């Protein structure tokens, strides 16, 4: 859809953007969001690096599921064809004071606007998909582009990586510095005569060790609706996520810490430390955010069944998966 964008700003070098009643602009340090509420224009600042990492995830994930929060004021709720953009709406205090605003959007329009924002606000010196130790600053005046980091083209996984008609392995990528000790050996495949290329196996740890992005579940095996979506996590999950289905985490290397709270209240429910080999169900009625000091291998196990929202709303699926 048609993006509403201004001329580059005379001082900062950046364009402001309009999306329905929202105004998005950035300066040398902050993204700034404005919106109407009770007759006045309301504003909110978010540090530009925090903002960009968050929007980068929202764009790469296609708005994910449930509530993707940039911070405790700004967020989106994917409605699977339409996406709500909200400010303070899911914030007890702002909501009670009636200074919040929400507006609904056809996915392609908000997506186009968002891609355009990343393009414009991401300088050549900053990669929104990387951990801080891996990249430069998002701060300062407009200064080049980083298309290569924000437009990562990916062949979708049909079955498994490495298959001929499928998503490629990563032998042409450097091992990340925090996985430099991980074996790079491939499994041995021994095809019986007349069966060359009928058997398939690759090194998942090697494949992960060569991941060039953080907090990005990517499909590595497909069993009907069941998807294995491993990802390498460093620093902090760039958003806090409000769930709308049960999620499963299997921690494969190192450790991650999850703050788990009330989707609406924000009230603490649990603090989960996941170590190598741990398996955890994240319930459909919480929100959470992860912390991973060392780049670690996390398996996110997804379920791509279309009527999930119906199942949870109906009561066919409880907020937590297992009674025992």
């Amino acid at each position: 859809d048609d993006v509403q964008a201004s001329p580059p700003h005379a001082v900062t070098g950046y364009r402001s953007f309009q999306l329905g009643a929202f105004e998005l602009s950035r300066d040398e340090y902050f993204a700034r969001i404005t919106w109407p509420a009770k007759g006045e224009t309301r504003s909110h600042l978010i540090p530009a690096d925090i903002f960009l990492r968050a929007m980068m995830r929202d764009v790469a994930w296609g708005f994910f599921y449930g509530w993707v929060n940039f911070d405790h004021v700004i967020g989106t709720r994917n409605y699977y064809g339409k996406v709500d953009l909200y400010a303070g709406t899911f914030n007890g205090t702002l909501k009670a004071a009636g200074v919040n605003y929400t507006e609904n959007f056809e996915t392609p329009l908000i997506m186009a606007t968002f891609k355009a924002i990343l393009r414009d606000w991401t300088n050549a010196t900053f990669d929104p998909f990387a951990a801080p130790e891996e990249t430069g600053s998002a701060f300062g005046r407009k200064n080049g582009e980083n298309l290569e980091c924000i437009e990562r083209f990916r062949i979708a996984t049909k079955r498994m990586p490495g298959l001929q008609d499928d998503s490629p392995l990563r032998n042409d990528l450097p091992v990340n510095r925090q996985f430099a000790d991980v074996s790079q050996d491939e499994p041995e495949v021994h095809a019986a005569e007349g069966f060359e290329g009928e058997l398939h196996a690759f090194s998942l740890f090697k494949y992960l060790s060569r991941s060039d992005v953080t907090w990005n579940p990517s499909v590595t095996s497909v069993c009907k609706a069941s998807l294995f979506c491993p990802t390498t996590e460093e620093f902090i999950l760039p958003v806090f996520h409000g769930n709308d289905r049960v999620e499963w985490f299997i921690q494969m290397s190192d450790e991650i810490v999850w703050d788990v709270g009330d989707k609406d209240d924000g009230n603490p429910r649990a603090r989960i430390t996941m170590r190598a080999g741990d398996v955890c169900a994240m319930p459909a009625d919480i929100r959470h955010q992860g912390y991973s000091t060392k780049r670690s291998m996390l398996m996110v196990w997804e379920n791509a069944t279309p009527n999930l929202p119906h199942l949870y709303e109906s009561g066919e699926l409880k907020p937590y998966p297992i009674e025992f």
């Binding site: 495949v189 009928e198 989960i272 170590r275 080999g277």
Partner: protein, 163 residues
């Protein structure tokens, strides 16, 4: 001074379960287990469900010795999380065409041999639909299987998860 990189992997011989710290509510809700503890306390090749989502399963297998021949009507996948497993593949003459979940293929499956794969830790292979496959393990290891709840899947949540 210290510049070493240590990617911590666990094993059957050496693992440290994480922790669920409850502020409010019940640890039950998080179905929290650890695949190494699980394999450590299970029979060889008992397919222990450690994740369940609308009938899709993640199973943990203790690889020790030689498994039964397995088969399914759809694709499955195996990740070797510890040890070293050899996986033998037969292309069945008469593959299961319908149904879900891994099934016993029988003592002597009828079909051409396709070969085998040698999986070490961190390695993944496809378990193609309409094939029979068998696991070989000289030393105790751990296999993660992605599949669908079936006749062989064992549930024992109260035994394996925090409560």
């Amino acid at each position: 001074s210290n510049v070493a990189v240590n990617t911590v992997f666990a094993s059957l011989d050496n693992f440290r379960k994480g922790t669920v710290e409850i502020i409010s509510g019940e640890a039950r809700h998080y179905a929290f287990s650890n695949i190494f503890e699980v394999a450590q306390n299970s029979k060889p090749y008992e397919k222990v469900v450690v994740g369940l989502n609308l009938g899709y399963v993640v199973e943990t297998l203790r690889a020790e010795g030689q498994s039964p021949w397995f088969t399914a009507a759809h694709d499955e996948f195996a990740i070797v999380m510890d040890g070293e497993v050899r996986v033998e593949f037969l292309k069945l003459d008469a593959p299961s065409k319908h149904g879900e979940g891994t099934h016993l293929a029988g003592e002597l499956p009828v079909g051409k041999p396709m070969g085998y794969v040698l999986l070490k830790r961190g390695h993944q292979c496809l378990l193609p639909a309409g094939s029979a496959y068998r696991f070989e393990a000289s030393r105790p290891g751990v296999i993660l299987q992605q599949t669908i709840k079936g006749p062989l899947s064992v549930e024992k949540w109260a035994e394996i998860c925090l409560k």
